[PDB]
């Protein structure tokens, strides 16, 4: 819901939503050629 | 645990070999001497380490020979751009005279 | 002990090397040296980068 | 009260109201460099 | 601020918490 | 890379001054430092130094008690002075290694005087 929003905030007023109890899959959206950039730091990608 | 810079002042020419002695009161920790070039109103850049090893980005001119208590600091020549006092930067087997010292300043002159 | 008076050097001592990624674990005493590019998560990297 | 020690050392000697900042440990001074001199591991109580 | 969320005498209710 | 130093001002002798290094392009949590002083006529001595663990403890024999160093955040390193003398009048360089250095920054002087 977050990637699908149709505005997003300038970078000084940076928004920010909180998620939990929730299920998460990030297999699927780190292996996607849509994402220019995708870099992992303290943790692995494999691990998500 | 002071390192003594004989002599003080050395002067040399272009074309003339460059040669200095720093002594050290007690032994050296395995070979950590290490000397810097310290201009006028700026902070010494490194010119030779370990004694003998050239870093990278450096002049092949600065040959060290020596180990334990005395060593010696030989340079093929000067392109009157080495002007500057070198400090021979004295390791120690920490906790035993400090744990590093520095010695005086032996700067070169050339006569022109 | 000690060795920084040789292997180290000024501006990068790259000679020596680690295995930074493996698919998987090691076995006591064995030794490595296929240095094969390895790929992660969907590995659909068949080629070079 | 509820300590043990091998030993206990007192020591006696005038100063003027202000040197008394000195007698704590690590302090510098006329007094504290060149009087008396206390280690910075200095264990015990001052008094004056 | 809310940070969780949930949306779900003849009787006797009772409850333990 | 590149380091810069703060915090030189005139200042009364017997009052503490703060003053610190901080490293551009590089954290200081993997390349060693050092902290030295050169008087405007004097030879260069070298006072603290710390990196990784806890390192601080290797203090200079003259420095004694009044000397401290410590890294407030990862690229910033904080100098701690007290009982300052007209004797301590130098030139504050943020060296990079203990027994081998790279590159230091300008240097800040900080002139003792009432």
């Not at chain 2, 950590?32 to 092949?60: C, E, H, M, N, R």
């Not at chain 5, 601020?1 to 918490?17: A, D, I, Q």
């Amino acid at each position: 819901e977050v990637f699908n929003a149709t505005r997003f905030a300038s970078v000084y007023a940076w928004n920010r939503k909180r998620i939990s109890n929730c299920v998460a899959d990030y297999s699927v959206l780190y292996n996607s050629a849509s994402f220019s950039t995708f870099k992992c730091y303290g943790v692995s990608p494999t691990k998500l | 645990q002071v390192l003594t810079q004989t002599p003080s002042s050395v002067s040399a020419a272009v074309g003339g070999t460059v040669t200095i002695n720093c002594q050290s009161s007690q032994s050296v920790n395995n070979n950590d001497l290490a000397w810097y070039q310290q201009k006028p109103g700026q902070p010494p850049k490194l010119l030779i380490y370990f004694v003998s090893t050239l870093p990278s980005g450096v002049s092949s001119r600065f040959k060290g020979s020596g180990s334990g208590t005395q060593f010696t600091l030989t340079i093929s020549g000067v392109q009157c751009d080495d002007a500057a006092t070198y400090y021979c930067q004295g390791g120690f087997g920490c906790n035993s005279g400090d744990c590093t010292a520095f010695g005086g300043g032996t700067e070169v002159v050339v006569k022109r | 002990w000690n060795s920084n008076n040789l292997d180290s050097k000024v501006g990068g001592n790259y000679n020596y090397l680690y295995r930074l990624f493996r698919k998987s674990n090691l076995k006591p005493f064995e030794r490595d040296i296929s240095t094969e590019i390895y790929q992660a998560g969907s590995t659909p990297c068949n080629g070079v980068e | 009260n509820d300590l043990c020690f091998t030993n206990v050392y007192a020591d006696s000697f005038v100063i003027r109201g202000d040197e008394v900042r000195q007698i704590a440990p690590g302090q510098t001074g006329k007094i504290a460099d060149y009087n008396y001199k206390l280690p910075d591991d200095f264990t015990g109580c001052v008094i004056a | 601020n809310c940070t969780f969320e949930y949306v779900s005498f003849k009787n006797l209710r009772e409850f333990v918490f | 890379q590149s380091l810069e130093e703060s915090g030189g001002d005139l200042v009364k002798p017997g009052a503490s001054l703060t003053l610190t290094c901080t490293a551009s392009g590089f954290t200081f949590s993997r390349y060693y430092m050092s902290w030295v002083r050169q008087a405007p006529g004097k030879g260069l001595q070298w006072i603290g130094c710390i990196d990784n663990t806890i390192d601080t403890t290797y203090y200079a024999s003259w420095a004694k008690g009044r000397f401290t160093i410590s890294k407030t955040s990862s690229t910033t390193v904080t100098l701690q002075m007290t009982s300052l003398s007209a004797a301590d009048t130098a030139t504050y360089f943020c060296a990079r290694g203990m027994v081998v250095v790279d590159l230091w920054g300008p240097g800040t002087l900080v002139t003792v005087s009432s």
